[PDB]
Each structure stands twice: as C-alpha cells, then as structure tokens.
Amino acid sequence: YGPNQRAQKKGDIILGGLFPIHFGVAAKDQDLKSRPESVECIRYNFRGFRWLQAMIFAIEEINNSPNLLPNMTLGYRIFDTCNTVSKALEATLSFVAQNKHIPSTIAVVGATGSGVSTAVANLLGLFYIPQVSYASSSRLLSNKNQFKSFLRTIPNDEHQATAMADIIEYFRWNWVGTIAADDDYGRPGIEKFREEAEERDICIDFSELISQYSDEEEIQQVVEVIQNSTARVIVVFSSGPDLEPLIKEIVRRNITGKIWLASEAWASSSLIAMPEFFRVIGSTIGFALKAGQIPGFREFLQKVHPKKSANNGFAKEFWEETFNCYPPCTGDENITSVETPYMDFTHLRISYNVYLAVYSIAHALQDIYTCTPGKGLFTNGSCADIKKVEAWQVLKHLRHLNFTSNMGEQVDFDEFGDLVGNYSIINWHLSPEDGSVVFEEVGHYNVYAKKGERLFINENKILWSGFSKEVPFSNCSRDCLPGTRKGIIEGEPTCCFECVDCPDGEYSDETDASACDKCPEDYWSNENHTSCIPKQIEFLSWTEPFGIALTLFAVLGIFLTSFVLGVFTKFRNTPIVKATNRELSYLLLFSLLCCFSSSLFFIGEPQNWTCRLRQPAFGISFVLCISCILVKTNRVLLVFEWGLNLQFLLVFLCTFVQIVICVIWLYTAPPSSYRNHELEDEIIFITCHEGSLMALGFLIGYTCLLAAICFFFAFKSRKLPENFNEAKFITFSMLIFFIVWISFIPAYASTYGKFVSAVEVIAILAASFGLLACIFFNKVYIILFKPSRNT
Template sequence: MRLYLKVHLVLLALNCGVLSYGPRQRAQKTGDILLGGLFPIHFRVASNDQDLAAKPESTECVRYNFRGFRWLQAMIFAIEEINNSSTLLPNITLGYSIFDTCNTVSKALEASLSFVAQNKIDSLNLDGFCNCTGNIPSTIAVVGASGSAVSTAVADLVGLFYIPQISYASSSRLLSNKNQYKSFMRTIPTDEYQAIAMAAIIDHFQWNWVIAIASDDEYGRPGIEKFENEMLERDICIDLNVLISQYLEEAEIIRIADQIQNSTAKVIVVFASGPDVEPLVKEMVRRNITDRVWLASEAWALSSLVAKPEYLDVMGGTIGFALQAGQIPGFKKFLQQVHPKKSLHNEFVREFWEETFNCYLVDSVRKEDSENGSAGFRPLCTGEEDITSVETPYLDYTHLRISYNVYVAVYAIAEALQDILTCTPGRGLFANGSCADIRKVEAWQVLKQLRHLKFQNSLGERVRFDESSELAANYTIMNWHRSPADGSVVFREVGYYSVSGKKGAKLSIDKTKILWNGYLTEVPFSNCSEECEPGTRKGIIEGKPTCCFECTECSDGEYSEHKDASPSRNTIEEVRSSTAAHAFKAAAKATLRQSSAFRKRSSSVCGSSASSPSSSFCMKTNENEAATPTGQRRSQRPRHKLLAGISQSWLRKQYNSVYKSELYHRLEISFVYQTPQLDL
C-alpha cells in the first residue's frame, strides 16, 4: 500500500499543475517558508454519490463548523504575530496553505497531496524536466488534523516524506507509536490518561454497572479498549458495548437505542466525537429517555452539536472532560475583525459570514445552494453586519482549549526554525555538527529540529517532541447545567484530573456543585445489584457477571458483619479483619459465661460484637457433653471446629494475650476447608 502511494506521488509530482491541486476552497498566503494547515471547517461531506456521467468533482462539504473556523483563525493569528515579531524569525516571513478536512479522511488526503507533491519536486530536482515556473516553497510542516482517524491517515502519507505533522486535537494512543508515525507530534495529551480518568470517576461514585459506547475509528476504539481494561482492574462491569458512527443507518441507530433503553445500567460512557454521537443523542431525545447519566470524552463534552438547550431534558447533568484552557492575548480582537472585504487570503470567511448572518454575498452562491434553492430564501448581505451582535461558537473565547493548542503548535514550528536560524556551525544537529540553511530548509530538517525542541508554553507546561514525550494530562471536569436566565447550556467546572510524573494521578470532584439530570443532587444509582445487608452474603447468579449477584442469608456456622459480604473463602478473609476478630471474641466469651453445663446438641448460641452492634452471627452446638463449670480445667479437651482454614499460629497471635487462660485451652482447630463453624 505504501509502495503504491509512493509511486503514485512521484508521478503526481511530475505534473506542473501540482500547485493548483487540492480542494478549491482554501486559505493561502505566500511567504519565505510555507506551513500547511488542516481544519474541520465543515462537519461532514455530502452523502450524494456521483454517477460519473461527467468528470467527477471534489465532494462538497456540509454543516458549517464555527469552532473549526476559529481554530483556523488561531493558526493565521499566530503566523501573523510571528511575522510581526522583531525577535522571533526576524526578516523571515511565514506563509500558509490551509484546507478544510470536512472531518473526513478522504478530504484530508486530498488536501495533503498538495503538501507532499511540491516537496517531491524539490527533493528530486525535476524543475528542468517538467518546465515548471515560479518559485513556490515546499510545505515544511503541517498543523493538523483534528480527529484521530483523520490524523492517522495524514500521518501515513506525510510521514513517507518526513514532513512534520503537529496535531492540536488528535489524542488517540495509537498515534504514540513513533515507529509507525515517524513525523507525528501533538500538543494534546494522549487519551490513555482520559480513559483512566473516566474509570476513576466511575469508581469515585461507586458505580459498577455501565454502558460503553465509542466511535468506530482510531479515536474511539483504542480509547474504549483502555477504559474497559481499567474497568476490569477495578472489578466494574460493562453491560453493553457499542460502536457508533455518524454514517450509521437509521435502523442501526434505533437498534442501539433499544439496547440502551432495555439495559439496567444507568451510566453511559461515550468515547466519541460530536458528529458521531449526535445521531444517537437525537434518538434518545426523541424517546425522552431521561434516567441516564452521560460521561463524555473531551471530543464531544463541549460540542455544539450535542450541547443544545433542546437536548437538556435528556442530556442535562452530563459529566464531561475538557482540556486545560489557555490564554491568547489579542486573539479576541482578531476574531472580531473578521470581514469578507478584509480577509482576502481566507476564502472560508465568505461562507462564515453567510452562515453567521443567514445571508448571501454577491457571486458566492454555492453549488448546493443553487441546486436546492436555499439561496433564494436568504437576503443579500450588506457587509455592514456586526459580528459582535450575534451569539456564535466562533466568538466563544472565554476558555480557549483547542485554539490554544493550535497556537502552541505554530509557535513550536517557529521555535524550531529559530533554532535553525541561530545555529552555530559545529554545534548543529546534522552531519559533523553542521547547520541547515534557513533559506533552503527542508521538511526533514525541521522534523529533526523539532525532535530536539524544548520550550515552555504560556501555561508553564514544558513542550517537547522527543520519541518518549507526551504532554502532561490535565483535564477540567465539567457538568452540564441549564441556565436559569435563558435556558441555554452552561458548562460548570466541578473538579479536575491531573497527572504528574512525580505525584501521580489526582482526581478531585466537588459533589456539591454537581446537578444531575432533573436538577437532582443525590448521586444516581448504577449498580447491577443492591448491596447485601449484614447477616446475608453474595450469591453467584449463573450466566451473569460478578457485579450481578443475589443476597442469601448466612447458613448455620457463617456470619457477615458488614454489607456485601462474599461467600465461602471470602468469608474467612473477612474474619481475619480486626472487627471480625473482636466479634468472635465477644461471642466466645459470652458462650463461656453460659450456665455451668454446655447445652445439648442443636441448641444455638448467638451473639453480637460490642465494637459493631449491627453485626451478628450464630454458632452451632455439638455433641452432648458432661457439665463443666466455667473456669475449671478438664483432663481431656473436647474437639471443636473453629473457623476452619485459619492457622493455629494466627489464632494464637490474635487471642492468646487476652483469653489464653480461659479460651485458648478449650479450642482445637480442624484444618478442613469449610465455612467457619464452632461446635460446642
């Protein structure tokens, strides 16, 4: 497969039309050094299949993504900021070529071909053969993509040519494999930490019966697999495991919703992207299933596709993960200054303007609008519209998370280029300590420099891209509330999860801030079985997981002094605890203080622990024996069975100091495994 791609790209590079290859719509500006960008400006591609009656065109994208456009703007803002700097890359101008992935692998690859093709021409020195004109620089690094599935495909392609790729939102742990993805880096922590954090939250609320749902891609599958392993280690059970996608047929969505509705598990863990989880949420809302708790991965925890006021009756109380927010000084003003007449290098601005104000600009009616007539229902844009007068996710800059990751990615590339610019011959990273020429720098040289880069971002985090590095995992835990003012969705911070190399992982949750669905404050119940009360024990239900059990009364000779006691061998272990030892001692002492003669066979002696009055147990009496006054010795000790399976040395250690003179000499241990029993 890789060999085929390589041959195909060599042929593509011979084509002088390579510079115009790729999607028509793009943001592009020339410079001394060119950076590529991949962003989800739309959520998906149109589903209509081309019949090939004419030459096929690039697939249209649908459903505008305002946050994706903000991420693109963050890249342009960072580049312009660097170009205006007198200390970082002075006299060097960065250019950019940015494409829309439409959150789809095919569109991302279509765009990525334009990155690698010019690099191939430069590396093979074929200008004389193809008679190309113009001096267009190679793309020396790519910022993107967003989804892990998209980034994985792009990494396979650009990695062939050692073009560094820095993703701002792809967290799949599969991408940590440096042997497979040689040129891939990221400014987001791997979701391996997030899976552990999800399991920690389940444990924190003492749930043991959950539903696990994941995107059927490189993000969801590895993430939920790690989560399942964490559940196994914590003895927590998963009732239902489902893979979803935005491209599932309606019948399949209905089938999955049926399974969820019929499940007794009330907690739904979803490791998926917003577009993938949206169809399922719509079906749950249609059915008005309100008795569930949703636990959201960061890919959809703040998604505008799902966090809608009309969904809150079902989705209210959702607990989700959010990346640590950063600050970008001056970015707010930059976002507010966007305008079709001012942003001549950014073709995405025109569509953004039309979608924001529900109007259309002259000569910008798109193909899909003309075909369905939607343009006729929109007024003409005046150009005087005020971007600050509307509410849009584009202007949600109070908590910059992904936008900040984009900003850091661009600065990482600039810092690597700065190291090349200021390199001292003899101390460089290349052969014999040589330095790369900043005016003729190639992608592989930038990749080498990035692997040795170490710098601090504005949050104080150390950013490095060596083979063993991963960013520290710091998540904010959010709770979905309904605003009492206007009914909108409010994301309230209720805790955090952080991982430090020295201190380990820490989960902190303020339960008093959490509102569960229906404005409830009591933690919902999501366990397969009710806990067993003292005096009963867990009984296995054949064909069910260990989290599902029935409570049965203790048999003669058994006791349980706390809730959820386990049968057989576990009961012995419970007796080893100090409270169980006290309970036994109290019972033994009470027995010895009975009448001057032992009771006859089948009579029973019951007692309770002074240290734990709620715990109770019964001890069976044995053969009819001669009366012996308490405190007197007998020449022949009677045989007794006491807590079979417990060693005599352990018994001596526990009881000898207190009851040696009165109790120990009256006991004899039978080392046959059975439930604890005392025969008198």
C-alpha cells in the same frame, strides 16, 4: 493545485493547515451511472473558523515580532477538511507535489481527526515532513515506527480513560455501559478503559459502536440495548458529529434516567450541548483541556470581513452562513450582533493548541537560524542553513525542541512526539438567564501525582439529574446487610448476585460477605445471625425455684431429725420403751442424718468430686438405714446361735458388702462429671455419666433385694402386737420404699440432664422421709402424748 476555496499567503517559508471548517459531506451515494464528480460538504462549523483565525493570528504575530526569524516572512497554504479523509488527502497531495514554481510547504499544522490525521501522516511521513497536530489524541499515533514525523500539542488519550475509571470508582459505581464511535478515536480509548475498569473490579454491561453514517436500524438496536439494561452510567468515547444521530434518537424515544460520562471530544460540543437535548440527557460530567491565554485575540476575531480578506478565502462563506447573504445584503453588518460559537467563548482550549503548534514550528525555525557552525545537530557537528532549509532538518530540530511558552511554561515533546497536560472536569449546567447549557468546572485531574491521588472532585457543585443532590445508585445488585451472604446468579457477571440468609449456627457481621462463619462450641448464632452469643448452659441451681423447694424439704427433714435427737438427749436414760437397744436407735438416727445430708450433693454444678461422692454417700447411708431396721426385728438368729456387738456384726457385715462395689467404681470407672450438647443444639447440659451402668444396677438391686427379704421376714411376723405392733410399721415403711423405687426407675430411665438428678434426689429424699415418719411417728407420738409404757 488542490481545491479552490482556501487561505493563501506568500513568504519565504510556507506552512500547511487542515481545519474542519465544515462538519461532513453531502451523503449522495454515487451509483456510478455517470462520472463521479467532486463531492460537497454541507454543514458549517464556527469553531473551526475560530481555530483557523487563531493560526492566522499566530503567523501574523510571528511575522511582526522582530526577534523570532528577522528579515524572513512566514506564509501559509491552509485548506479545509470537512472532517472527511478525501478532502484531507487531496489537500496533502497538493502539499507534497513539489517533492517528486510551486512553493514547497515545510510543515503541516492540522488534521484535527485521529482518523484523518492517521491517513495524512501515512503520506507525509513518507517525505519526512513534520506534522504538528492540535486535536488528534488517539494512542495509535504514538507508534513512531509508523508515523515518523507526527508531533502533537494535545495530550494522549490514555490518561483520559484512566481518569474515567478513577471517576467511576470514586462515586462507587460498578455497573456501567460504554459507547464509542467506530473510528480510530473511540476504539483504542474504549479498549484502554475496558482494561483499566476490569482491573478495578468494575462490570461492563453493554458495548456498542456508532458513527455518523450508521443506518436507522442499527441506531434502533443501540437504543434498545440501552433501554433494556439496568446500568445508569454510560461512558461515551466519541465526537460531536459521530454522536448527534444517537442523541437525536434518544431524545425522540425520551430516555431520561441515565448519566453520561462525556469524553473530551464532545463534552463541549455545540452539536450536543443544546437545551432540547439537555432536558433528556440530564446529568453529564465530562473532561476538558486546560485553558489558554492568547492576549489580544478577540480584537483580531472582531475584524474579519469578506472584502478586506484577500488572503483568507473562507471569510466569504463565513459571512454568508452568519448573515444569509448573496437574500443579498450589504457586507457592513457587525459580527457582535449575532451569537455564534465564533466569539461566544470564555476559555480557549484547542485554539491555544493551534497557537502553540505554530509557535513551536517558528521556534524550531529560529533554532536552525541561530546556529553556531561548530555545535550543530547534524553530522560531523555541522549545521544547516535557513536559506535552503528542508523539512527533515526541521523535524530533527523539532524532536529536540525545548522552549518557553509565553505563559511561563516549558514546551518540549516526548520521545513519542506528544505533550502532557492536566485535565479540568466540567459538569453540564443550565444557565438560568439564557436557557443555554453552560459548562461549569467542578474538578481537576493532575496526571503528575502518583497513581491513586490524581483525581480531585468538588462534589457540592455537581448537580445531579437537575434537581437532587445525592449520588445516584448505579450498582447491578443491591448490597444486602450482614446476616446474609452473596449467592451466585449463574450467567450473570461477578457483580450481580442474589443473597441468601445464613443458617442457624452461622453468622456474618460484615456487609458484602462471601460466606457465613461457624462460631465456637459454647457460642451460638443469635436471632439475626450477626454475632454469636455464648451458648446457654443449664443445670440444677440454688436460686432456681425447684432448687429452693428441695432445699427446703432437706433442711426441714434435718431439723426434724435434730429435734428428735435433742428430745432423746433430754430423756435418754428412761427405758420406758427405750428398754430396746438405745444404741440401735442412735445409729438409725445418724444413718438417716447421713441420708438427708446426701441431698446437697445434687444442687450445684456437677464437678467430678460432687457426684463421685454423691453415689457412695447415698449408698452407704441408705444401706445403713435398711440394715439397721432389718436387724431391728426379732432375735430369731440370735436365739439359734459380745453384748450388742454381735448384732453390729451383721450390719458391719452387710454394709461392707455394698461398700465393696463402691470402691470398685473409684478404681474402675468414676462417674464422669461431663457436658453434652447434641441433645439440644441450643442449650448445653452438664451431668455425670455413671462409671459402670450394670454396677449401679447391681448396687440398687442389692439394697432393694435386702429390703425385700426384710419385707418377707417382716410380714411373716406381721401379726404380733409387740412394741405397739411394729410389724405393720416395718411393712408400711418398706412398701413406701418399694413404691418410690418403682415409681423412680422408669421415669428416671428416660430423663434428660437436669431431671435425672432431680428425679433421683426426690426419690431418695421421699423414701428416707417416709421411713423416718413410718418408724418414729407412733413411738415419739405416744411418748409426747401418753407417758405410760410398761407393756
């Protein structure tokens, strides 16, 4: 006969009912020293009584409506579960009694716990009795090979975990921790969320299991792992009662920084949503089912009364727990005078599910009632009769039930027995009028939209941590700027890293970089390694200061030469001292002009033409000068052996000699005008690699040797006062040549790009300038000075 505290009402058809009027049982572990007696449940749940009242109201409204099942009455045998499996199981045993004078229940509306409903459906489905639950939302109840006769008016919990992952990815967090009740409601949900979050590149720090029967040390361990972690977001998948201990311990230890992502079961629970817990838990964003509309329901709630309720039996205990009677009292108080979750509501969510379940079973019964004997759902097109209806026929009609909810909706269960709905997203607020927690809706989750466009959050209503209004930071490692790259911290997950600076020559312009990048050759990483600047080129220029200085030297020397030439064009035909070979003087002139014009060849950017001509031009001009001054000595050789031409011979001999090696280059190895970077790694250089090193050595040795023999045979006659004793002048000029050449070679041999050209150019310009001076100064001075040359 089941328990004695129950709600009961007769009728042709009887429906079952399991509601959590209490919260749990008295935890007295029977040591079995005596016969174990029937355990007792302890706490009270006004929400559960609201649900039971909703079911009773639905049945009464069905019995009152004249169209749905006329000339037939609905009865019920509603029991209490106290949220435990033992009570539900004894109740269901009282249900299926007559199967194998007692009424035979045809349908069961209840089992609000996914652990409770599992154990109930295991037993009901053995007799094929339809069980229409309203609040059990575990996914395991979708295995229609196990629970053959289980339907539910509440959506499955897959979309809830998907929505959790979507919310976490929307606020751009990647470091969370998960808590789930060690039950059939938290385990599968947390597993689904784990996979959905790992596929979205989200890292999970910790994962713990709790329950209302967990001892104190395990709660200590959980609080420790919560405190010892850096994750700010905590995804809780549990119900009110199985969460209350953890909340009490967290309030006692005063952990304040975290953010709670509430599941639907406890996001609106009065056990948790109280101010002293709110000050500590801070910000909670949770889900909620869609509201309902049961017109005329409040006026039914306001009529509950302990003496005017013979059918309902829990009304007495309700009166007691709400007024503390039997301190005996009157029984004529007002339910509106005290504030309890009973009528302190604005949106009916689970009560609407109970209403819908009762109405769906009534509609299946009507469907069986309005049959046509030819188009039935059973074998041979036959159909069943409502006077001897059995449970399996009602199950058959429920599988194919498809009707219209008074809100103008379409109600029809899937092939997995469940319905589907679109969630509201609420965020906990503190009412400035009362102090109580009030749930304000801030977002929506439409599950019909395509994957990726389902969530809609209105961010300006979310109140973060009570005061501030920017999204808190809950990443593992700080995201560091461009110029840096991620760096593995071994042991830690893929979301936690250090970041190391990029070396020079590599850059990174992106945030969250995986590796730095080498830029092309003529580019180089800048000072912040964020963008490569074209690598600086360097060479001798014209706007450059030293460029202008040597240009000044060259042009002034050429101007001196042009002055000498003009003067000689004025006074050519006077052999006063020009009795010597005037042609030899003019040839010295043009040779020195070519020398001074060889300057320009080392001023700009060296292309191949430039230096490929800058070696031979200097070569020929310099050997012309030195050979002219060589043969410009005494005619000893002439005495030993047409016109001046014979002397020309010697020069037009010796020049050609050098010229030979010259052409060698142009047909063995031109001086390559190329670049070089290895020497600086920051600034590029451009020079000319000499085509043949030993051949350049040969060239300079040839010209210098000739000048040396000139010095020898010049100072052997170094004491003859002819033409103002030019012997000392030629020796002085050649000593100038040798000093500049010697001061040139070593410093040159160890110079980098620009200064090789610089040194060579200054050496040549100085040598030729000194020659010009030391040879023409005395003569032009005595002509401009004392016009008397006869001896």
